[PDB]
Amino acid sequence: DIPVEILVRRLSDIKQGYTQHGGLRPFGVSFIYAGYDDRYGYQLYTSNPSGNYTGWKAISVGANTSAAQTLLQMDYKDDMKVDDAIELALKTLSKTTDSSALT
Amino acid sequence: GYDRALSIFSPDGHIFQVEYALEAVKRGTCAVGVKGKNCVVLGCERRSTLKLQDTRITPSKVSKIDSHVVLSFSGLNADSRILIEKARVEAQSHRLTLEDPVTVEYLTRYVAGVQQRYTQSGGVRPFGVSTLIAGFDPRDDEPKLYQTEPSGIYSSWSAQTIGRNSKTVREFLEKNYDRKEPPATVEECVKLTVRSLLEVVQTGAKNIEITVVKPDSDIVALSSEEINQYVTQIEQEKQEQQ
Amino acid sequence: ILYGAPGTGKTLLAKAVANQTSATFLRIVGSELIQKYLGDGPRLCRQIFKVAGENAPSIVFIDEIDAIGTKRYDSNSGGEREIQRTMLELLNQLDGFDDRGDVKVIMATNKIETLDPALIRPGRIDRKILFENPDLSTKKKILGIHTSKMNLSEDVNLETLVTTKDDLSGADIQAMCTEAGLLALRERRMQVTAEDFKQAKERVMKNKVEENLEGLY
Amino acid sequence: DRGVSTFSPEGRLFQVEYSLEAIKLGSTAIGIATKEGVVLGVEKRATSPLLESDSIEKIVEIDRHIGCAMSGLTADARSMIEHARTAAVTHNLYYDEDINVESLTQSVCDLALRFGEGASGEERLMSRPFGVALLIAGHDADDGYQLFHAEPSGTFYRYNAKAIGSGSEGAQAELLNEWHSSLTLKEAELLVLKILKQVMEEKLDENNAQLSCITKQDGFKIYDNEKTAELIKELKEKEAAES
Amino acid sequence: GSRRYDSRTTIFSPEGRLYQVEYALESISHAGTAIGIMASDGIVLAAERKV
Amino acid sequence: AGYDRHITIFSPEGRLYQVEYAFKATNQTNINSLAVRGKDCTVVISQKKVPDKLLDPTTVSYIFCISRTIGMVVNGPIPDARNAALRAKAEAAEFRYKYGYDMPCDVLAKRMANLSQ
Amino acid sequence: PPRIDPSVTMMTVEEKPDVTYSDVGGCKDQIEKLREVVELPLLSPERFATLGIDPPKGILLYGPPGTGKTLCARAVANRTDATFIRVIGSELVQKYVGEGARMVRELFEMARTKKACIIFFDEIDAVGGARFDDGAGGDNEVQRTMLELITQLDGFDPRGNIKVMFATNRPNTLDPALLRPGRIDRKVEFSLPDLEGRANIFRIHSKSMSVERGIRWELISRLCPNSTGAELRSVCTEAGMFAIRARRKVATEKDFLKAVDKVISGYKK
Amino acid sequence: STRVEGSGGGDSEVQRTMLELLNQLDGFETSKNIKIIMATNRLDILDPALLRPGRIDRKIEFPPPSVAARAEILRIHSRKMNLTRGINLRKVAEKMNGCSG
Amino acid sequence: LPNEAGRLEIFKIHTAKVKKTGEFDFEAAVKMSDGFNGADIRNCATEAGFFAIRDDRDHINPDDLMKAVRKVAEVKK
């Protein structure tokens, strides 16, 4: 299986390429990468339109990034389980919506 | 195909793209380099606007060309990656053909050369990053620190800093280094690097990163406690009275 | 020339210096000179300079010149003529009458690079003043003044608020004083507690400090 | 925007003139050619106590009989040198003899006019002329010790003394009076040091100045920091004794 | 002219940013929200379907 | 980009200036044309104006014979009319060899259309 | 006898300016031409007469404004004992129908009554300048002012009394009718000063200031980037600001170097 | 019934002028008893220094119309004129969706 | 813009009122002319006559007219 950390780099270099050479537009897209390795456990990255990419252990992108992240920083805890994380995601999601309640 | 120009010669004499490149270095990271008689230390401050990161699945700011050659940067991540990719191919290529790892000087010429070339052709414009290239030649023990900038110029320096708030730390080096004595004590070379970054980082002593390169594939990241120990020591110096 | 953000240093600095020297401070609305007529912009601009020399001493603060400006690539263009006309009158008015001390000009713009390099003109505008960001210690200082004028509770700790603030300019610091103080005014109280400040610090901090992953590197 | 085909109403291109401005934003570089040897001198400069001026240099070898001093944008001349060396080595293969200083200047100048956005007779492999001027000095056993001024324009001039860089007008005037072909190799260097100090805004010492020479017994040899220093003391003492 | 249609918007600015890049960062704030949580037992991914 | 008066792109009104002006001058040859179909035949009648008496009429045509069966009437300026005729005649000839069959009106039409777009 | 009058005009008159040259180092060339065109026909008309020539009616001075270009204008007026009339070109351009054409006739008549006088037009970029619109309901109004101005020049005017000296920041977007002889005979170039040039203009400012005595401006000139005459003056006063800031009476070479380093970066665009 | 919602001409520029005045009052005279209220429907008339605290300090949402709110308004306007008591403002309010005041 | 038939008619009237050689050909002119309007056809009548004042006579020839029409034609579309 491919490492995540490499695969991310190939996308970012390509984005970077278009704005240096070719006269092209860059792509207007951010990815949040969710992948697994047995050299690192779970890895989670994000790449963005400048060709810069970073690792995060929790991340938000899109509308109201700042606000979501602020809530995320408090509710985060070193101890984890998936079902606990499912609750965490949803509590936050409800409070970042630009429309009333949540569905 | 395409080959319309993006480099256009300035009536300054200093091209537009070179001058706007240098700005990119100031916004970016901070990197500093100190040479010993036996070491070359490369210090970087971490600035995380918010941190939800780990430090082990983030890409680290001192990047290996080789087991015993590092390259350190200030500027944009994106650009620097390209410079790194080309250098890892060049590392191997000398190793294949001369039967010996790179000299540091040739590699420095190489990183400069790609930058210089993108200033000279159309259709390409040059990279937004200045670098610190350091390492050791085959059968050698004497540190090499060179500084390369997007103009494609390079030169050797016994101490240097680049990136954000270069001025303050340059001065700080002018009054805290000796040219009749580069320190031959690994501890005082790390010490100086920690003093330099301390004065800028604002808070946090695990938002300081040291990378030490000693001869013969000895690249070592010193750990949290060791770093704390110099910081304690710097407040004893600052709250000294007779 | 003073360039930063208005009411953060740019407005303030010019207000201070005016107080010291007992000079008439004259606030000139950049935009109102942007009249949609012809002949009209330069004679409006000229009138401003006439009155400045008559009623010396004075500091002339010309607020946010970029609406009458815009550099272009040419010194006159087949676009709008009125915006170009006011700009050349403004360049001629520094270049063609010079003063010792009787009239001093402070010019304001958010971006000094949208101005023609000959409208900057060394030998009048010698000083080019820019804006630094607050460090932790400055945040403490700027905060201390604003609270002298408040009344508040003694469980509020300045040091604590300051550490957790990072990358806020003084404008955000002023807003905080008013926002925490507003929760006290809602609870009908003319002290302010510790608690008001914490929520206030957090909120302005959040809005200013939008992330787009453009930092970092 | 702009193009690179644009002439001025004179008929001399824009970028070329702008290239001459860049040369003047370099530092003074002096070459004097006399009967025996060619001397080339540069200001290394030293602007900081932390700068290693004694680990860098600005006088570069083209071949085992041809050196060069540069002034301008010193990166841009790495491309030029690299190309010249390739030419210089290829002539040693092809005929087994020294490459003329002149034949080389001509080769190198041909590729200094190679700037454009593509045309139907020629390759374009630069967008803009180099920011950099050269003094190439050498020796061949056909017309002996020589000096040439290589323009980024692509014109090539034969000389006997030339200075380039910011102070070249003052240095060249002094040179015209001092130039004789009855001056020994050592003398030429001493007269070069006197002038080089003048044009300098700071004290002249080994740690900011470099001598180099071309002899036909041992070729281009870059002179040691020590040997050049020894003469700086001797310059200082004679000069302060006619006062 | 070919270069007289070019605008060169792919280059570094006088502020040293890349016009088109900065504009793309903007784009991402007008599209839905995406959140990534990594736990050591799984990874939870959500992305918000707007309209 | 930032240009539409030196290069061709979509209008925000949605009516492309280059296409509209191309709709307009074609009439610079002083032509008027029609074609009708009979039960068994297709007839074209076309005007000719001769602007000099240093000119022969019999080399002046606006009908070009593409193949043996296919006709084409061009209404336009004649350097552009001919440019299309040269291209059409070869594509027709190429089709006829490849596909064993004489080019349809509609297919010739469609192919030149897709190229102009 | 009441024939040809000022009428009602709006102008700024300075009989005998208090301004003399302070740039001679990069504007050596503008002075050599100036002297010959304006100063000498007024001082001896008879010379020109014996040649069989009459001097230029109008001269255009171009390149960057105020780098000694403006100074040269005021200076020649003082030297000839002629009225200096500053018109800002942009004020003589009006929307208002003709308001613009009318204003232009009254200025040239004014000039005729008061003849042996220099009309200095700051900015002809305003008055003419680029377009593609060729009238538009706002570039018609401008064109009408431009055209009326030509009419007086190319008609009947005195070339030996009335001088018009025009100033611009770019003569390449100006119409060929503004450029051509029949209106502007000599077009003089601004030169960014050379190292030697910088030294003479420096030498002028340093007839004040307790700079060290033995100073070599030539040495300072060689480290300087490019500068204009405006910039060289600018450095000198900023260096005095460093002397007061540090609370010390005298000036060194160093105070001047430090001021260069700052001002050039600040300038750029 | 009111033309022009703001434009690229003189409505946004005039809106800058007003802010300037407000700065000056807290300045020399430190007297301020006259307050300006802005109303807008568009964020394209606004720029961030304009929303920056010390020009515009409060951003208050004006009531988005709901069924309960619509009945209330109706009841107040009906309390001026002759309408039957048999009417049910709850019915009339529920009939209207996408209706302002 | 007039017919072919219309050009012939407008030419007839305008060279009628001008003096001429007994043999004349309206038709000849009419073919060469395209994109003219009535004012342009009158000018052609007068253009021929200027060259007849030149040639020291009162009489247009078909020969003046052939020149006149082609010149008016050249100076425009």
Place this chain on the structure above:
Amino acid sequence: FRNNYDGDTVTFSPTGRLFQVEYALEAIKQGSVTVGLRSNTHAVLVALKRNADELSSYQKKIIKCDEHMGLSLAGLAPDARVLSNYLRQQCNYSSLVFNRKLAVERAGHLLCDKAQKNTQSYGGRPYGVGLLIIGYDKSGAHLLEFQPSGNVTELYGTAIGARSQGAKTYLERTLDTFIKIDGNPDELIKAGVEAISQSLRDESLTVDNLSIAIVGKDTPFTIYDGEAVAKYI
């Protein structure tokens, strides 16, 4: 305005010619002055070479292109090299392929096409250097004027460079005399020196400055440079 019609090479202006062609034409004159004369048996070129300084020395601008063919330039040195290289390949091919010594007429037409071609691009440019191309083949001696516009005229004498006209009027006078001095190397050289002096009015006539070049009935391409022109002064 100006900047429209200088900044593009694939344009034209209302006059019937682009501005760039006017500047290239100006540039030939910015060269140092050189005359060419022939009687149609021999052809001579006499050229005044200036050098930048007393500390510069002269570098060649009369170019052997074959042992029967050459050129002089006036105008831009960089460009002149490009053209000279082209004519040289062209001379070589003519010998290898056809056994020919190349006529000027055939060479000119070929140099024209390349020039034309580089106005059929952006980032190509006219040369902006003119050449007097001489050679002695079987229809005799020949003198051509090549211009970087593509105008090729054969003239019996001509000049290019600053103050062309001075020699040119002298040449239109002495014409009839020189064309009937047929078969003489030395009479024509003497003429060339006399000619070049009617150009001069702000420059000196000195041994080292002047440079002579010949090809002719019994002379393959031989240059007199430096010392070796003293005896024709």
Place this chain on the structure above:
Amino acid sequence: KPTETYSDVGGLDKQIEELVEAIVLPMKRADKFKDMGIRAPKGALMYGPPGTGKTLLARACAAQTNATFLKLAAPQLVQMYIGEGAKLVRDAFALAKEKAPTIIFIDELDAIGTKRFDSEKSGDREVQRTMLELLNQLDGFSSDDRVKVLAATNRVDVLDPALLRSGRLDRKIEFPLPSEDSRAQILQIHSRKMTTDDDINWQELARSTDEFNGAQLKAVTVEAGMIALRNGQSSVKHEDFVEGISEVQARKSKSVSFYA
């Protein structure tokens, strides 16, 4: 009385013939035009550069016919107040009819010669109306040459289908870039005014000047005279022109650094 003569111009010869045919031949031999029955122009259009010798020749025709010269400047008519210009023109023509022979000289015909083509003419209706009013009047009479109107432009950018008709602006005269033979004649006019030493070679200078307009030629001459002054002479020689051309006054320059 303008004092202009056809000896003050030269090498504009073919264009001299066209103007003289258009306005003078109708005036003098009116009975010949009348009897023929051809309409005689009452307007002529000139375009080209003024001061080359277009303007000079107009003034010259007026002087020769001993017509009243009236210079009306087109920007003058353009009033911001409600039709002043239309009114001025009807008075311009009425006085013209009274004053005959007369040349009504109109400098500029692009200043009123814009009139827009969209719904933008609404604004710029003063400029459309004044231009239309002269043409309606000109066509409102024919076969007479009592008034001539002659129009001049600084640079032609205006021409219209409305201008056409014989009683309107019949004549379209172009004044070109001078030929070589012509520049020499212009120089020899100009140099008449100069005190010469008679060493001036006319032929040489005319070839060397390339891309010069008649007024630009005048500029060389004043410059040569200016050099002579510095040199300490009261007269000029041939060298003084050669030097003169190179100088900057017409966009012609020299340079060095292309030679060794």
Place this chain on the structure above:
Amino acid sequence: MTDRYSFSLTTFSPSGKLGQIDYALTAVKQGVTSLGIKATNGVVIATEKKSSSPLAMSETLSKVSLLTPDIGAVYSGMGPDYRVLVDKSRKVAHTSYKRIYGEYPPTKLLVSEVAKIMQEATQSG
């Protein structure tokens, strides 16, 4: 000597919007009515055929095209753009899923090729 141009014709704007795409959104609006209903039990597509001369025919015009046998497509926007796109789309569907396969393409997969083509033309000048 040409084909050296590749600078984009779709750029970012200061609202991060795409210039051409705003322009094109109008073009769709100036079209005629076309609809789709999926009943689950099939798909129905309908449009108005309309034509630009009375002498033309809209009986002999088509605005639904077969892309592959089992799939038909319809549009709103400009006639010329639709014809070239349908041709290119018909080409890739045959080549890549009947020479590499033999089953006619799944629908969604065909949509991804049409989408890739249109975006490709937006990236590249």
